[PDB]
Amino acid sequence: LSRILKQLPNLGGSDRKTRAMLLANAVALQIPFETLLDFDEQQDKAVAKFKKILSKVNENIAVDTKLAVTYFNNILRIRQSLITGITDPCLVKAVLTSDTANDYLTVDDVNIVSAVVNGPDYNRIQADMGNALNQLIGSID
Amino acid sequence: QQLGFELSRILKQLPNLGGSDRKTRAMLLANAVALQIPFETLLDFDEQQDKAVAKFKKILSKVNENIAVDTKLAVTYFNNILRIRQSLITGITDPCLVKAVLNDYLTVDDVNIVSAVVNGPDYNRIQADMGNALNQLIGSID
Amino acid sequence: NYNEKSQRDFRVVTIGYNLAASRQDEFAERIYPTTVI
Amino acid sequence: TQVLVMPKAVFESYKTAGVQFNKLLDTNYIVSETSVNDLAEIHQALTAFPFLLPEKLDIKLAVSPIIKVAELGEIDGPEQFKMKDLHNRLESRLATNELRDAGNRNLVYDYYLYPVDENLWVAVQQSAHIASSDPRRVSIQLNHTFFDSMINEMLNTRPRESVASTQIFTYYLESC
Amino acid sequence: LDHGYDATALLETTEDIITGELDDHLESLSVE
């Protein structure tokens, strides 16, 4: 536990904040959200288990447990939006140009995503398609 | 306003260069639709992919009545973007997404830069060590 | 027939021909943008 | 030949995108046309391939791309350090997958053979089936159409009498 | 027509153009 925690470089006063993010991801990776339920029963169970896991932070070095819960709850809500579907260019950009997206895309595919996403008018065009689809996606049999 | 015409009208507004236009045109359709289509709760990924692609191809059939799109390339992009979306809902959520949606200021680049200079583990390797060093705890409890 | 070598039962491959062209070509569309009446 | 196991998701990408299947054994080509996750999943799919190939007929299982990348990262050249960076990404992504799909545990896959030349036997890893009691026998019965596909292809070059003595031929007989 | 054939009413109002440009600029900020 502490062996790997000591691998994180010290950065200002954020030592208690980056590890809070790392822990929130470490738990959220292995507690899935069952698509069958909505965001109340499966959400409360995932959060309850996370808070129970925080009971062992005495073995850790620098974990801000109040922020770690904040990060964990943000992960679940972000997953809810992704399940339902996202169009907001401010979040679509964040997904398309990300550490996960660079592992599923090839080098050439990323170069293309970086050409569209970083266009001077991307946010406007992406928003317009979001409405064009949100209003009419159901028309497609 | 048929969806094929509205999407085509919007795509016409992308800047043009030359033949590279079909790669960026296809990518944008893949991005918008792969992320916009809602997932059905009763399906697993295998079935959700088959259903989402069936609709995506039907959308291209309507778009290709107005603006030319390479069908095979657009599907290639669609499947890649859809898999990313599926991974995020079942898998690890990037901290840039928690940061983007939610006092969050110091970013990942900031620690990956230091790790690169000292030639040590980066954020993603540390994240992998975290979960691994946590595997036993989560599996043991419920 | 000492040598029985295939002469007629060849593999038949069909070349596709149907196309779904997009109204007027992109060349004409950029010059004469389509308005639906 | 050399069997290269890849998930259906990766195979369909190769076919849809139009990636030359011939050059998937050449590390320098597959890494350019293959994502980091796809390369990691190919490694995982190779390590989940239950069947022993007929080594007596010079049929080998492919070395996973991660090993090939790791080896090139240690060999002097103009791309060595880029290949080292790729290796590190593959290890982190592989560990991330292993921590997520560890729950899979007791299941076996259907495989589909897509022959590519005489030096590459693409083996597509398709739908999973749940198998806890005697999964070895369940895997054999499920992959009937995989065993006969392998037999059909190796009988194109190998002598029939030699193929008949392989475990792949036996597995076909055990299935039906 | 929309309003009417009187050529004076067909002319677009400058004050409405200024308001429209302000509304379009603010809409873009909401999207971005």
Which value, in Å, is the CA radius of gyration of chain D? 17 Å
Distance between the termini of chain D: 26 Å
Structural class estimated from helices and strands of chain D:
alpha/beta
Give me the secondary-structure category of chain A.
mainly alpha
Oligomer: part of a larger assembly
H/I helix tally of chain D: 9
Question: What is the percent of helical residues of chain D?
Answer: 40-55%
Main sheet makeup of chain A: none
Largest sheet of chain D: 4 strands, mixed
| Strands of chain D, total number | 4
DSSP strand content of chain D: 15-25%
The interface involving the most residues is between: A-B, 77 and 72 residues
Order of helices and strands of chain A: HHHHHHHH
The strands making up the biggest β-sheet of chain D line up spatially as 2-1-4-3
Strand content of chain A: under 5%
Q: What form of chain A results from the Cα inertia axes?
A: globular
Number of strands of chain A: 0
Terminal Cα separation of chain A, in Å? 52 Å
The amount of helix of chain A comes to 55-70%
How would you describe this protein?
The structure is cut from a larger assembly and holds two copies of chain A, one copy of chain C (37 residues), one copy of chain D (176 residues) and one copy of chain E (32 residues). Helix content of chain A is 65%, strand content 0%. Chain A is built from eight helices and no strands. Chain C has one helix at residues 26-31. With 176 residues, chain D is α/β, with parallel strands linked by helices. Chain D contains nine helices and four strands, in the order E-H-H-H-E-H-H-E-E-H-H-H-H. Chain D has helices spanning 8-17, 27-33, 36-47, 65-72, 80-100, 135-142, 144-154, 160-163, 167-175; strands spanning 2-7, 60-61, 107-116, 120-130. Chain D is globular, with a radius of gyration of 17 Å. The two termini of chain D are 26 Å apart. Chain E is mostly helical. Chain E is built from two helices and no strands. Chain E is elongated. The termini of chain E are far apart. At the A-E interface, helix 8 of A face loops of E. The PDB classes it as virus. Keywords: phiKZ, capsid protein, viral assembly, Pseudomonas aeruginosa, jumbo phage, virus.
